[PDB]
A paper describes a structure:
In the c-di-AMP complex, one U-shaped c-di-AMP molecule is bound to each face of the disk, and the binding modes of the two c-di-AMP molecules are essentially the same. One of the adenine bases of c-di-AMP is located in the cleft between the two tandem CBS domains (CBS1 and CBS2) of each monomer, while the other is projected into the solvent. Specific recognition of c-di-AMP is achieved by a large number of hydrogen bonds with both main chains and side chains of CbpB, some of which are mediated by water molecules. The adenine base in the cleft is recognized through hydrogen bonds to its N-1 and N-6 atoms. It is π-stacked against Tyr45 on one face while its other face is flanked by Ile19 and Ile128, thereby forming a narrow pocket for the binding of this base. The 5' phosphate is recognized by hydrogen-bonding interactions with the main chain amide of Arg132, ionic interactions with Arg131 from the other monomer, and hydrogen-bonding interactions with the side chain hydroxyl of Thr130 through a water molecule. In contrast, the other adenine base of c-di-AMP has no hydrogen-bonding interactions with CbpB, and it is not flanked by residues from the protein either, except that its N-6 atom is positioned against Tyr45. Overall, the binding mode of c-di-AMP in CbpB defines a new type of nucleotide recognition by CBS domains.
The facultative intracellular pathogen Listeria monocytogenes, like many related Firmicutes, uses the nucleotide second messenger cyclic di-AMP (c-di-AMP) to adapt to changes in nutrient availability, osmotic stress, and the presence of cell wall-acting antibiotics. cbpB encodes a 150-amino-acid protein that is conserved in some Firmicutes. We determined the structures of free CbpB and CbpB in complex with c-di-AMP at 1.6- and 2.4-Å resolution, respectively. These structures reveal that CbpB has tandem CBS domains (CBS1 and CBS2) that interact to form a disk-like head-to-head homodimer. However, here we found that CbpB is a direct activator of RelA and that c-di-AMP inhibits CbpB-dependent RelA activation.
Residue numbers in the entry:
A (entry chain B): 12 to 143
B (entry chain A): 12 to 73, 75 to 145
């Protein structure tokens, strides 16, 4: 229902490049402001999602949060790999069902090439539009 | 509408307390799994919202300076300008805020924190409507 024409194009999407370390990923997360962003390789294929909580949980020590380890771990060590996806817009009831539990959903082609995202905000804008 | 009945009760909402340091706030954020949560005082008054993004941005030097986490208080970085629900008389205002806020706190007239209203409850009704045709 014209969620297709609303998808946030991949090139406007903040992301972390695969292979980067967690120090770098924290920097990208902090600068862009977004709490969960996708992880891509140099061909812009989607491998996972990353957040600050994923990074911090991975450096929890027995006495302190071991930040010195941020340099040593890479984003693929801690990124989330099981996450829903959209391959086409012929099933946009699925998008809405999905958005109930996921702030955004990645859309990809058959080769898992990252096309962009659909966000809750897109839907809620339309809901507020039909009431007022 | 039924928006009132679907509020998440306060006892189910993770929060950090005033006066703690930024390291404490990170541990709570990381442990509870939510990325933005309220800041309450010892009487359950609502004072702010805090995320890891606010925390890390506050120690972002010229490199991130994690050593200052023990010296900064949550009230030094928490967000203090945010909307709140006082009543459920104007629920189309609640739909309007969810456009730009993943959740909105509801308070009583003394700013005691009573719970939150999340985008998720509106999205469920949307999904329900489409399932009925
Ligand atoms: N820089 C900004 N400008 C304006 N509003 C902002 C904003 N940052 C956050 N918000 C508001 O906060 C909501 C939650 O953002 P969060 O980063 O947790 O979660 C976001 C974020 O993780 C991801 N996302 C959205 N846009 C993105 C982008 N350009 N790049 C990367 N990720 C994005 O999708 C989730 C849902 O986004 P949605 O827009 O529905 O909902 C957003 C948006 O309504
Ligand atoms: N344990 C869990 N079980 C089921 N689903 C989970 C979950 N943790 C996260 N999610 C899903 O992820 C969405 C975004 O969560 P986030 O922590 O960014 O953003 C959350 C968080 O900042 C806050 N929030 C919601 N419930 C909370 C709670 N019990 N305590 C503290 N904050 C909460 O309101 C935002 C919107 O929450 P909403 O439920 O609309 O949307 C949630 C929820 O649908």
């Amino acid at each position: 229902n014209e969620l297709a024409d609303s998808m946030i194009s991949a090139e406007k999407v903040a992301h972390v490049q695969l292979g980067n370390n967690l120090e770098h990923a924290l920097l990208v997360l902090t600068k862009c402001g977004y709490s969960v962003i996708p992880v891509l390789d140099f061909e812009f294929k989607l491998h996972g999602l990353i957040s600050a909580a994923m990074i911090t949980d991975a450096i929890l020590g027995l006495e302190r949060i071991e930040f010195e380890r941020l340099e040593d771990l890479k984003v693929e060590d801690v990124m989330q790999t099981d996450f829903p996806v959209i391959k086409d817009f012929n099933n946009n009831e699925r998008i809405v069902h999905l958005l109930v539990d996921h702030p955004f959903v990645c859309v990809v082609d058959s080769d898992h090439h990252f096309e962009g995202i659909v966000t809750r905000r897109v839907v809620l804008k339309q809901v507020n539009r039909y009431i007022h």
